[PDB]
A paper describes a structure:
SARSr-CoV spike proteins cover the coronavirus membrane and are exposed to the solvent environment in preparation for contacting a potential host cell, undergoing a suite of conformational changes to bind the viral receptor known as angiotensin converting enzyme 2 (ACE2, in the case of [name]-related coronaviruses) and mediate membrane fusion. Each spike is composed of three identical monomers containing key domains involved in restructuring from the pre- to post-fusion state as well as in receptor binding. These include the S1 receptor binding domain (RBD) and N-terminal domain (NTD), the S2 fusion protein (FP), heptad repeats, and the transmembrane domain (TM), among others. Here we report three novel structures of SARSr-CoV spike proteins belonging to bat SARSr-CoV WIV1 (hereafter WIV1), and civet SARSr-CoV [name] (hereafter [name]) and SARSr-CoV 007 (hereafter 007), at resolutions of 1.88 Å, 1.92 Å, and 2.10 Å, respectively.
Coronavirus [name], which originated in bats and transmitted into civets sometime in the 1990s, is thought to be the result of a recombination event of bat CoV strains Rp3 and Rf1, with the recombination breakpoint at the nsp16/spike. Alignment analysis revealed other CoVs of bat origin were more divergent from [name]-CoV-2, but [name] is genetically close to [name]-CoV (GD03T0013) and the first epidemic [name] coronavirus GZ02. Previous studies have also demonstrated that the presence of a fatty acid in the FABP is responsible for regulation of the “up” or “down” conformation paradigm of the RBD, whereby presence of the acid ensures the RBD remains in the ‘down’ conformation and loss of the acid appears to permit adoption of the ‘up’ conformation. These structures reveal the presence of linoleic acid in the FABP of all three SARSr-CoV glycoproteins. Remarkably, the maps reveal a conserved network of water molecule coordination of the fatty acid inside the FABP. These waters support the acid within the pocket, in addition to a single putative hydrogen bond formed between the carboxylate head of the linoleic acid and residue R382 of the spike protein, at distances of 2.4 Å ([name]), 2.7 Å (007) and 3.2 Å (WIV1). (c) Water molecule coordination between the linoleic acid and chain A of the cCoV-[name] spike is represented by a yellow dotted line. (c) The [name] map possesses the most isotropic biliverdin density. For example, in the [name] spike structure, the oxygen atoms of the fucose molecule on the N770 glycosylation form putative hydrogen bonds with the side chains of S901 and Q904, stabilizing the carbohydrate tree. Further, the glycosylation on N145 coordinates two water molecules between the fucose and a main chain carbonyl group of the glycoprotein. Further, N709, N1134, N1074 and N1098 are glycosites on the distal end of S2 near the transmembrane domain of the [name]-CoV-2 spike and are conserved in WIV1 (except for N1074) and [name] (except for N1134).
Residue numbers in the entry:
A (entry chain B): 244 to 291
B (entry chain C): 677 to 772
C (entry chain C): 965 to 1012
D (entry chain C): 821 to 916
E (entry chain B): 677 to 1108
F (entry chain A): 532 to 592, 605 to 650, 658 to 676
Write the structure that this text describes.
Amino acid sequence: LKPTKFMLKYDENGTITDAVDCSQNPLAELKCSVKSFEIDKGIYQTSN
Amino acid sequence: SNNTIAIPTNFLISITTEVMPVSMAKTSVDCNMYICGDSTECANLLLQYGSFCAQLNRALSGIAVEQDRNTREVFAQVKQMYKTPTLKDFGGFNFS
Amino acid sequence: LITGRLQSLQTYVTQQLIRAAEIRASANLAATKMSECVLGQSKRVDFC
Amino acid sequence: AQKFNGLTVLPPLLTDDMIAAYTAALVSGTATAGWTFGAGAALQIPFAMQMAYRFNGIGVAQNVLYENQKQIANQFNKAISQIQESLTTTSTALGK
Amino acid sequence: SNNTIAIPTNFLISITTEVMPVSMAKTSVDCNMYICGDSTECANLLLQYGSFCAQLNRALSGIAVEQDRNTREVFAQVKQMYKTPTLKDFGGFNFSQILPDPLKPTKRSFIEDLLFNKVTLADAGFMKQYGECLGDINARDLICAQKFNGLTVLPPLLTDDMIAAYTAALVSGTATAGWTFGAGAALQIPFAMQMAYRFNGIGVAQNVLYENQKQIANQFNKAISQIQESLTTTSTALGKLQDVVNQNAQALNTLVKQLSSNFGAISSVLNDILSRLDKVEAEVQIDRLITGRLQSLQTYVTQQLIRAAEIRASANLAATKMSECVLGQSKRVDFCGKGYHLMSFPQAAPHGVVFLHVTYVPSQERNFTTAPAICHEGKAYFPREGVFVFNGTSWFITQRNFFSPQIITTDNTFVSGNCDVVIGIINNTVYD
Amino acid sequence: FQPFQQFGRDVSDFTDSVRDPKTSEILDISPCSFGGVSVITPGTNASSEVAVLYQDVNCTDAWRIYSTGNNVFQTQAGCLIGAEHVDTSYECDIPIGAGICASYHTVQKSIVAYTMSLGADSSIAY
Ligand SMILES: *[C@@H]1O[C@H](CO[C@@H]2O[C@@H](C)[C@@H](O)[C@@H](O)[C@@H]2O)[C@@H](O[C@@H]2O[C@H](CO)[C@@H](O[C@@H]3O[C@H](CO[C@H]4O[C@H](CO)[C@@H](O)[C@H](O)[C@@H]4O)[C@@H](O)[C@H](O)[C@@H]3O)[C@H](O)[C@H]2NC(C)=O)[C@H](O)[C@H]1NC(C)=O
Ligand SMILES: *[C@@H]1O[C@H](CO[C@@H]2O[C@@H](C)[C@@H](O)[C@@H](O)[C@@H]2O)[C@@H](O[C@@H]2O[C@H](CO)[C@@H](O[C@@H]3O[C@H](CO)[C@@H](O)[C@H](O)[C@@H]3O)[C@H](O)[C@H]2NC(C)=O)[C@H](O)[C@H]1NC(C)=O
Ligand SMILES: *[C@@H]1O[C@H](CO[C@@H]2O[C@@H](C)[C@@H](O)[C@@H](O)[C@@H]2O)[C@@H](O[C@@H]2O[C@H](CO)[C@@H](O[C@@H]3O[C@H](CO)[C@@H](O)[C@H](O)[C@@H]3O)[C@H](O)[C@H]2NC(C)=O)[C@H](O)[C@H]1NC(C)=O
Ligand SMILES: *[C@@H]1O[C@H](CO[C@@H]2O[C@@H](C)[C@@H](O)[C@@H](O)[C@@H]2O)[C@@H](O[C@@H]2O[C@H](CO)[C@@H](O)[C@H](O)[C@H]2NC(C)=O)[C@H](O)[C@H]1NC(C)=O
Ligand SMILES: *[C@@H]1O[C@H](CO[C@@H]2O[C@@H](C)[C@@H](O)[C@@H](O)[C@@H]2O)[C@@H](O[C@@H]2O[C@H](CO)[C@@H](O)[C@H](O)[C@H]2NC(C)=O)[C@H](O)[C@H]1NC(C)=O
Ligand SMILES: *[C@@H]1O[C@H](CO)[C@@H](O[C@@H]2O[C@H](CO)[C@@H](O)[C@H](O)[C@H]2NC(C)=O)[C@H](O)[C@H]1NC(C)=O
Ligand SMILES: *[C@@H]1O[C@H](CO)[C@@H](O)[C@H](O)[C@H]1NC(C)=O
Ligand SMILES: *[C@@H]1O[C@H](CO)[C@@H](O)[C@H](O)[C@H]1NC(C)=O
């Protein structure tokens, strides 16, 4: 294990069914920054 | 006077200039970089604090898109790219 | 320190928004002048 | 320093060459077709005839333009040269 | 080339659309409810702190009044409510799709119905009852949370039916009375004669309209049908109005979400702090939370003010366009559509207005040989209005916009000087 | 809830659910205050009486109102208390909303509510 940031998804019943690891790659970083599992077509700024 | 009138007898051609701003610089801000630098403890503290800077980046990106919109709306009116004529006289009117 | 620096960033962004509004007004006027003085002849007094 | 503190400036979508190309196309279109009432489709016309049409637009007879064509062209060229000379001299013309 | 000119030989009628925002949502904030909830101790602490709720509410109420001002200034220009005519033909120009249909229950027109279906809004009704929010709960409705945290959305003064009535009156007035230089006393006139007058406005003879009335009417109807079909297909034609709606919703939801920020306190939950700590120790944490939440509200209000300024500029432009393109004929290039402006029709849309600009576009241009002046009997002749053209066999006078050769006559030319001055003069005869 | 869960929180970190320690039944917790309120006045100079508009109450035919009085009725803007309804239309004096306005008219005077008038009626035969 390593210290990292995650974004977890709770469904209607309260169970965790999916997650995003914010450090996997730039797409995951963008997903965590906007707090969404879906991204629309376009170009976005990320961290330096 | 109620019985006289002044009438011009000649004319002249004048050319004047008008300067107008169109766009400004587009900017973006790195939240953690500005607030905390390279410190991991400060980064964790900021995450606990609840920063509101996705909002700031939304506003700045809106401005950045608006700048390109301004430039396009000013300069891209004509839909045909007319070529530059070889001759630049046109009956004594120098366009060079 | 975090509170102070966040306040600084917020002030910067607000002033940027106001300046952008001013620039947008200027650009709209410039587009109107391009349409009415370069692509046509204007009868409005002291417009071109 | 700005970059080290996480502040970035982004480039505009249209380069200076593209804006210059747009302005060149606009000037060429005015000199060659001189649209009236919008862009539409370019309709070629000799420049002197266009100047006569505009003179009619401001309520002057075309014979005034045709009979004094050389003098009017000289005045136009002189005004352009004066603008160029004024720009060359250091000043605050572009203060905005 | 210095001796040729292109002249149009045909024309077509084009209708184009322009979408403009007019107003945004009106909002109000109960600062005590948002900051402290139902806690009495937090309320007393906030009273001691010196909150500035009144200032924020003054700003928000100003914005709310300005929205109704915008709508009124755009849509209520005409002071007479003209009734919808029973017949919707007016000499072959079909007006049925842009006027309310008596048979159908709806009070709007077909195109207005299409427009209102293209923008999706979640807040519809401006009434959410306590029993409803309690009964649902499981749904986690966004509006219920907004209202539970003291954020309210107020209804506009004018309903959709009233705006539709205004647009119907404007269209009926244009169809039956026409209007020339504003909205005064309606002066009835047959529609074909009005179209001939507007053709004269752009510099075309009335005979062109009268002789081709059927073809022009067919082109008008076809353009209307094309607009309708384009609107029917899914697209982003009304992106600006949807953007306004989305921005307001996002602002409110972000305000609700920001209640989970610690702001440097031990916890963001007031009940936790008040259950763990005594008054003196709890005061520090509660003061930190109060400062943070007040800052959040201030940011929301400032952004609302800036957006309101932008919307006001847009509404002013829309009112000017309604005054200068619908109640008159405009000579400004590209102000009302692309081409030569003939007329315009307004239609109501969610939080905005759609203008249909009908314009005249030349087409099928052909080239000709032209000269500046004509040298006849050692005298220079210039046209008073037009241009000298050579169609291959003889010289005529023609208009720039439309090709209609005329015999060179002394009634459409004038003389000045000799033939030794004009450059490029040509020799030819002049009839009676 | 899971056996190891006792409290529940929503997106705003407000404690919205709890398990009962004795019966183990789950319960939702909701705030007590809810609903928008507006006050219409002709000006303290003219009178001290006012009308109250409750935006989120349906009074048609337990009501969350401070004090029911005379002339309580429902409008498209909510439940209105303290104003008389008139079927005539006038120009808007005080804009209530959703096409409803209010004024201070002689019945002594009282607050009245009505539908606003859009403009003069006319017919121009074609
Ligand atoms: C406030 O609530 C009323 C409901 O009125 C009753 O009291 C409340 C407190 C609750 O107990 C309700 O369940 C009760 O109904 C709403 O008015 C009702 O709206 C509904 C939905 O639009 C109407 O249902 C339709 O109404 C039509 C019936 O037509 C025939 O009957 C009516 C009533 O007798 C009569 O006016 C009409 O002339 C006909 O005789 C019809 O479209 C369809 O069949 C259906 O029944 C219902 O009729 C309404 N009731 C009344 C009494 O007006 C309000 O809408 C609500 N306000 C708001 C702002 O939401
Ligand atoms: C259209 O105008 C160009 C440019 O002329 C220059 O700009 C004008 C607005 C005026 O201010 C002119 O006085 C100015 O020169 C004409 O072409 C240019 O002509 C000038 C002379 O008039 C040339 O300058 C000469 O160049 C060499 C080097 O010095 C020597 O012959 C002379 O000493 C003199 O300086 C110049 O090179 C030339 N080209 C340019 C790019 O400037 C052009 O002739 C004119 N068109 C017509 C049809 O008249
Ligand atoms: C003015 O236009 C209306 C509406 O016509 C419709 O919209 C136009 C913009 C065009 O796209 C038309 O093609 C389109 O229909 C005319 O009234 C409408 O006419 C159409 C036929 O042209 C009727 O549709 C018919 O309805 C039934 C059921 O299908 C059958 O007879 C036919 O199969 C066909 O579908 C339509 O019902 C009718 N009414 C409406 C409200 O659309 C109208 O006649 C015309 N005015 C004049 C003077 O020509
Ligand atoms: C949420 O859970 C329900 C119920 O799931 C079952 O019952 C619970 C109390 C618990 O014991 C679960 O582990 C059980 O699986 C799901 O709806 C039921 O799903 C099952 C399995 O497919 C099906 O047989 C039942 O008919 C369903 N009952 C209904 C629909 O009333 C539901 O799908 C879960 N939600 C999600 C998003 O996965
Ligand atoms: C916790 O105790 C309650 C109630 O305690 C008993 O009843 C009280 C009224 C009082 O007399 C106490 O001293 C008693 O010890 C239990 O609730 C009861 O549960 C049973 C289960 O069969 C039910 O039949 C009773 O009606 C319930 N009583 C009431 C008053 O509702 C409860 O089950 C105990 N909880 C646990 C986790 O053991
Ligand atoms: C130029 O226009 C003239 C005038 O209309 C044309 O001459 C006419 O030709 C038609 C047949 O095409 C005759 O019926 C008319 O009597 C002619 N009018 C005259 C002689 O005044 C002429 O054909 C046109 N030229 C071209 C090349 O199209
Ligand atoms: C057009 O330009 C040519 C260039 O050689 C010239 O000879 C001719 O006289 C010009 N024509 C007119 C009408 O000015
Ligand atoms: C208050 O109303 C009374 C009665 O009409 C009037 O005399 C007075 O001028 C008004 N204004 C005040 C008291 O400020």
